[PDB]
Design a protein around this motif. Structure first.
Motif, PDB file in Angstrom:
ATOM      1  N   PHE A  86       9.292   4.097  -4.888  1.00  8.76           N
ATOM      2  CA  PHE A  86       9.031   4.233  -6.311  1.00  8.76           C
ATOM      3  C   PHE A  86       9.250   5.677  -6.735  1.00  8.76           C
ATOM      4  O   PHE A  86       9.145   6.603  -5.929  1.00  8.76           O
ATOM      5  N   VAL A  87       9.559   5.859  -8.015  1.00  2.23           N
ATOM      6  CA  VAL A  87       9.717   7.180  -8.613  1.00  2.23           C
ATOM      7  C   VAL A  87       8.818   7.268  -9.834  1.00  2.23           C
ATOM      8  O   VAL A  87       8.899   6.423 -10.731  1.00  2.23           O
ATOM      9  N   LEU A  88       7.974   8.294  -9.876  1.00  3.75           N
ATOM     10  CA  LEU A  88       7.016   8.490 -10.957  1.00  3.75           C
ATOM     11  C   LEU A  88       7.507   9.635 -11.829  1.00  3.75           C
ATOM     12  O   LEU A  88       7.265  10.804 -11.513  1.00  3.75           O
ATOM     13  N   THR A  89       8.188   9.304 -12.922  1.00  6.64           N
ATOM     14  CA  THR A  89       8.753  10.310 -13.808  1.00  6.64           C
ATOM     15  C   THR A  89       8.273  10.050 -15.225  1.00  6.64           C
ATOM     16  O   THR A  89       8.144   8.898 -15.644  1.00  6.64           O
ATOM     17  N   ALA A  90       8.006  11.126 -15.960  1.00  9.12           N
ATOM     18  CA  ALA A  90       7.314  11.030 -17.236  1.00  9.12           C
ATOM     19  C   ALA A  90       8.183  11.401 -18.430  1.00  9.12           C
ATOM     20  O   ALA A  90       8.161  10.696 -19.443  1.00  9.12           O
ATOM     21  N   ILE A 107       0.836  -1.188   0.000  1.00 10.86           N
ATOM     22  CA  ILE A 107       0.000   0.000   0.000  1.00 10.86           C
ATOM     23  C   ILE A 107       0.877   1.247   0.000  1.00 10.86           C
ATOM     24  O   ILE A 107       1.966   1.285   0.582  1.00 10.86           O
ATOM     25  N   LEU A 108       0.388   2.285  -0.665  1.00  9.55           N
ATOM     26  CA  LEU A 108       1.124   3.529  -0.837  1.00  9.55           C
ATOM     27  C   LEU A 108       0.682   4.513   0.238  1.00  9.55           C
ATOM     28  O   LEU A 108      -0.516   4.765   0.393  1.00  9.55           O
ATOM     29  N   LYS A 109       1.644   5.063   0.981  1.00  7.44           N
ATOM     30  CA  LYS A 109       1.336   5.933   2.111  1.00  7.44           C
ATOM     31  C   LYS A 109       1.765   7.377   1.878  1.00  7.44           C
ATOM     32  O   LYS A 109       0.981   8.301   2.107  1.00  7.44           O
ATOM     33  N   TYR A 110       3.002   7.595   1.436  1.00  5.27           N
ATOM     34  CA  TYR A 110       3.550   8.940   1.305  1.00  5.27           C
ATOM     35  C   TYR A 110       3.961   9.206  -0.131  1.00  5.27           C
ATOM     36  O   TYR A 110       4.548   8.339  -0.784  1.00  5.27           O
ATOM     37  N   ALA A 111       3.651  10.405  -0.615  1.00  3.97           N
ATOM     38  CA  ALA A 111       4.088  10.867  -1.923  1.00  3.97           C
ATOM     39  C   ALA A 111       4.540  12.312  -1.808  1.00  3.97           C
ATOM     40  O   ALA A 111       3.827  13.144  -1.239  1.00  3.97           O
ATOM     41  N   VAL A 112       5.720  12.607  -2.344  1.00  2.44           N
ATOM     42  CA  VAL A 112       6.298  13.943  -2.313  1.00  2.44           C
ATOM     43  C   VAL A 112       6.606  14.366  -3.742  1.00  2.44           C
ATOM     44  O   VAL A 112       7.484  13.779  -4.376  1.00  2.44           O
ATOM     45  N   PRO A 113       5.899  15.345  -4.296  1.00  2.00           N
ATOM     46  CA  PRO A 113       6.244  15.847  -5.630  1.00  2.00           C
ATOM     47  C   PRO A 113       7.303  16.928  -5.545  1.00  2.00           C
ATOM     48  O   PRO A 113       7.261  17.752  -4.627  1.00  2.00           O
ATOM     49  N   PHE A 114       8.258  16.838  -6.462  1.00  2.00           N
ATOM     50  CA  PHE A 114       9.308  17.814  -6.522  1.00  2.00           C
ATOM     51  C   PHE A 114       8.953  18.688  -7.708  1.00  2.00           C
ATOM     52  O   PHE A 114       8.611  19.860  -7.545  1.00  2.00           O
ATOM     53  N   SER A 115       9.004  18.109  -8.900  1.00  2.41           N
ATOM     54  CA  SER A 115       9.200  18.884 -10.116  1.00  2.41           C
ATOM     55  C   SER A 115       9.049  18.022 -11.351  1.00  2.41           C
ATOM     56  O   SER A 115       8.179  18.268 -12.177  1.00  2.41           O
ATOM     57  N   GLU A 116       9.903  17.015 -11.479  1.00  2.81           N
ATOM     58  CA  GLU A 116       9.795  16.073 -12.577  1.00  2.81           C
ATOM     59  C   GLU A 116       9.679  14.638 -12.104  1.00  2.81           C
ATOM     60  O   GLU A 116       9.492  13.737 -12.914  1.00  2.81           O
ATOM     61  N   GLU A 117       9.788  14.417 -10.802  1.00  5.25           N
ATOM     62  CA  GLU A 117       9.633  13.076 -10.266  1.00  5.25           C
ATOM     63  C   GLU A 117       8.724  13.058  -9.058  1.00  5.25           C
ATOM     64  O   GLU A 117       8.685  14.014  -8.294  1.00  5.25           O
ATOM     65  N   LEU A 118       7.974  11.982  -8.887  1.00  9.35           N
ATOM     66  CA  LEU A 118       7.127  11.855  -7.718  1.00  9.35           C
ATOM     67  C   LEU A 118       7.540  10.619  -6.987  1.00  9.35           C
ATOM     68  O   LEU A 118       7.521   9.533  -7.538  1.00  9.35           O
TER      69      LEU A 118
END
Lengths: 50, 31
Positions: free
Chosen positions: A25-29, A5-16
């Motif tokens: 995990f890193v969410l980058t597009a 389960i996913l608990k914390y997410a911190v957006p910077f700029s180009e990666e989440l």
């Protein structure tokens, strides 16, 4: 392979950063996010807590 | 970018419509 389960997410700029207990995990597009190019990578394995 | 690359290779065709028409000959009258 491990239902985390996913608990914390911190957006910077180009990666989440997605943080789940034993897997992070890193969410980058690149360019626009736009679903087709959304991507995810399992970077680290350290332990976070609730 | 695997999803974006492959979808770009999909390329369905538009295939605009095309229609034709009917024809009638007619007759020549005698007496």
């Amino acid at each position: 392979n491990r239902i985390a389960i996913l608990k914390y997410a911190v957006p910077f700029s180009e990666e989440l950063l997605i943080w789940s207990d034993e897997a992070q995990f890193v969410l980058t597009a690149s360019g626009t996010l736009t679903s087709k190019s959304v991507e995810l990578n399992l970077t680290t394995q350290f332990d976070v807590q609730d | 970018k695997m999803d974006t690359n492959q979808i770009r290779a999909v390329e369905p065709a538009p295939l605009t419509q095309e229609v034709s028409s009917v024809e009638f000959g007619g007759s020549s009258d005698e007496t």
